[PDB]
């Protein structure tokens, strides 16, 4: 998963 | 042989003071934030489940991160890259056969390249000066579990559970040493399963009184009570497994009886 911050 | 038990504890106590992140490091970070750091750590728990990594690897990974982010400012775009490279390093130190690098690139949905993972690895070793043998809550718990009368697997799993939750939140938990969080967790998990208390065995071993533990313990109690409402939940899902006696079912005690 690409992490949305 | 427990001929070294005491030396190893004492040594681990010495070494945990040298591997201590700065506490107010997050406040000095202009772009990243404790809430993003919970997201990362929570992610790394899921990575550990996917690749069936040891709990220690995860604990070591989070130590590397907190120390890294203590010297080095890091942008949100790149915080996952620090975490990925920390897990790889942890895996290299702690496990028998680490996941290939490719796998670590995969788990980020190719947001970073393999070269970037590998060259952040090498950057984490520079900043950490190869000081990877960091004591962790998991290590101190293991040492404490030898002093249980009797061995109780529910208490151990639940102590492991609580230890992990402490990784998620720097907000209270960076101020406490791995040995103290471990002492809080052992007591909390012991109190929760049997109603018992931090044993006098471990008061003399660690030199910690229940009362000296109480600040960290209260914090850990709040986290346990709030755990179902917590934005991050990879750890609860983990310890829902029968591998762990589903201790993350067990109902937290609403009071500590201090």
């Amino acid at each position: 998963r690409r992490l949305n911050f | 042989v427990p001929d070294y038990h005491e030396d190893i504890h004492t040594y681990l106590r010495e070494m945990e003071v040298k591997c201590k992140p700065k506490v107010g490091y997050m406040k000095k970070q202009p772009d990243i934030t404790n809430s993003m750091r919970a997201i990362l750590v929570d992610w790394l728990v899921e990575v550990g489940e996917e690749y069936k990594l040891q709990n220690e690897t995860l604990h070591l990974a989070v130590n590397y991160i907190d120390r890294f982010l203590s010297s080095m400012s890091v942008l949100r775009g790149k915080l996952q890259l620090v975490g990925t490279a920390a897990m790889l390093l942890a895996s290299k130190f702690e496990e028998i056969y680490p996941p290939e690098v490719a796998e670590f690139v995969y788990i980020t949905d190719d947001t970073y390249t393999k070269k970037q993972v590998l060259r952040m690895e090498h950057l984490v070793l520079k900043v950490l000066t190869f000081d990877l043998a960091a004591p962790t809550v998991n290590q101190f718990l293991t040492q404490y579990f030898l002093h249980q009368q009797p061995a109780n697997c529910k208490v151990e799993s639940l102590a492991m559970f609580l230890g992990e939750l402490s990784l998620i939140d720097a907000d209270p938990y960076l101020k406490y040493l791995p040995s103290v969080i471990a002492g809080a967790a052992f007591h909390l998990a012991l109190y929760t399963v049997t109603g018992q208390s931090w044993p006098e065995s471990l008061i003399r071993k660690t030199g910690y009184t229940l009362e000296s533990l109480k600040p960290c313990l209260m914090d850990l109690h709040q986290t346990y009570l709030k755990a179902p409402q917590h934005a991050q939940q990879s750890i609860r899902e983990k310890y829902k497994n029968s591998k762990y006696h589903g201790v993350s079912l067990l109902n937290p005690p609403e009071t500590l009886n201090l």
Binding site: - | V1, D3, Y4, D7, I8, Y11, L12, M15, Q54, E56, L88, L89, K92, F93, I96, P98, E100, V101, K114, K115, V117, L118, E121, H122, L125, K126, T129, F130, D131, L132, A133, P135, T136, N138, Q139, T142, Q143
Partner: protein, 296 residues
């Protein structure tokens, strides 16, 4: 690396091309473990991570000093104290006359001192063998090659298929134990002690099962009395032959009663009962210990 001249290669291992090198500024001679280091494929290998992190913490007269680490774009150089040969080479050379007894005692005393230090600093060596023990001309011996060394803050889960080296492998590994303990280092060190005395390997087996049987042939097949839990180990078989202890005195002839006591305690079957490095230092075999020099 500006300030190092390479002099010659003096062997390899993990990482490889271990060179003799001399510091052009200070004049010191060191060894240069140079690590190839896959710039795109794998990164820094697990053996470098372990060795460097563990040796940094281990400062002892009987453990090879890591003097520096040099971290460039595509190379990682390790700098150790120089030691001009290893025990294996020194045994082949001394095959015929024997390594003299006084020197064996010094060497085992020092190795025990190095091991005691590692173990007290929660570090298992894992791969103790005469190749990985280095000696200098002034009589010292040191633990080297920590690439398989592990931190046992948590117990160290063992390899399903052991990679480590048959002849110095403990019976608990052979029998599928879930975890290493300090004991496994003791067992190896005991085999090496025996080996120096007799000029040949104590248990030179040709497969995993031949290794076990060579141990069982000498020390006797273990039962629950000697070794609680053995019948419960994963790789234990009721079908194993039962041999009887042979005369320990005929297994290591040159050794006297103190030497045999110590060897038999380092070669105990039960990890729990096997002597630690610390306690082995108190043993009366070391009461007349000196520090002779070798003829290399």
């Amino acid at each position: 690396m500006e300030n190092f001249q390479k002099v010659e290669k003096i062997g390899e291992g993990t990482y490889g091309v271990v060179y003799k090198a001399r510091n052009k500024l200070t004049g010191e001679v060191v060894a240069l473990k140079k690590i190839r280091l896959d710039t795109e494929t794998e990164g820094v290998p697990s053996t470098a991570i372990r060795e460097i992190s563990l040796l940094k913490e281990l400062n002892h007269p009987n453990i090879v000093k890591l003097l520096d680490v040099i971290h460039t774009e595509n190379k990682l150089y390790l700098v150790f104290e120089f030691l001009h040969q290893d025990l294996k080479k020194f045994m082949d050379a001394s095959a015929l006359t024997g390594i003299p007894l006084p020197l064996i005692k010094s060497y085992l005393f020092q190795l025990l001192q190095g091991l005691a230090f590692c173990h007290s600093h929660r570090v298992l060596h894992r791969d103790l063998k005469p190749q990985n023990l280095l000696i200098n001309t002034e009589g010292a011996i040191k633990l080297a090659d920590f690439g398989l060394a592990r931190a046992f803050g948590v117990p160290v889960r063992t390899y399903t298929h052991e990679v480590v080296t048959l002849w110095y492998r403990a019976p608990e590994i052979l029998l599928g134990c879930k975890y290493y303990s300090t004991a496994v280092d003791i067992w190896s060190l005991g085999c090496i002690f025996a080996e120096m005395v007799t000029r040949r390997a104590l248990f030179p087996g040709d497969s995993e099962i031949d290794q076990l049987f060579r141990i069982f042939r000498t020390l006797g097949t273990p039962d629950e009395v000697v070794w609680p839990g053995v019948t419960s180990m994963p790789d234990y078989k009721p079908s194993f032959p039962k041999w009887a202890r042979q005369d320990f005195s005929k297994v290591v002839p040159p050794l006297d009663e103190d030497g045999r006591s110590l060897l038999s305690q380092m070669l105990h079957y039960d990890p729990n009962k096997r002597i630690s490095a610390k306690a082995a230092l108190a043993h009366p075999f070391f009461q007349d210990v000196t520090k002779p020099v070798p003829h290399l």
